[PDB]
Design a protein around this nucleic acid. Structure first.
Length: 61
RNA sequence: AAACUUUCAACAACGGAUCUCUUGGUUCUCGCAUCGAUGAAGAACGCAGCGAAUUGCGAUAUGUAUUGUGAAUUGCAGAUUUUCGUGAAUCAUCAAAUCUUUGAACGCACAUUGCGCCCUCUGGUAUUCCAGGGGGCAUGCCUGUUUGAGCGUCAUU
């Protein structure tokens, strides 16, 4: 007894212990290898003659 | 008389009838029961040495694995010797995988390849910033879970 004197007439939802995930098995099972590798990002270089201008003269492959 | 018009012939056009064909349909019978949040159906964009479509598949992209078959594929090119072999093939089979972006579509959005937050790791002086790799975060309901709320309500110091 001697109850909780409150000030806010507004009764908000009382902050509580939001527990985190501790799942009994991995959903994915095997972590997937990198979607987008080094080699998989950059495919072919270019041979359009006006790129080979830009390579040699501008220093941009 | 010629030209012309007409009729009719052979040959030639035009045109695609007829005939004959037929990997399509068609109805009838029989057998079976098997989609999907373990992401279905559908879509989008891709992917072939040379593909536009089709067919197949998903950045492991006309496939990988497995098994069988036992030498193809074939338009060209090309391999490779694997041809008394754990092994050819646009083969069959198919139980292992991959399965972009989507889509019931599920972080929140969605005429946008937009905008977040969390966990973890690696870069950059980094718990907080950025970036990269991974794994997440939908709603309802259910069973439990812990955390709580109500002088709803009981019993105690």
């Amino acid at each position: 007894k001697a109850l909780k004197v409150r000030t806010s007439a507004s009764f908000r939802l009382p902050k509580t212990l939001k527990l985190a995930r501790s799942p009994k098995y991995a959903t994915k099972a095997v972590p997937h290898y990198n979607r987008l590798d080094s080699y998989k990002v950059i495919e072919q270089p270019i041979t359009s003659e006006t790129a080979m201008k830009k390579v040699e003269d501008g220093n941009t492959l």
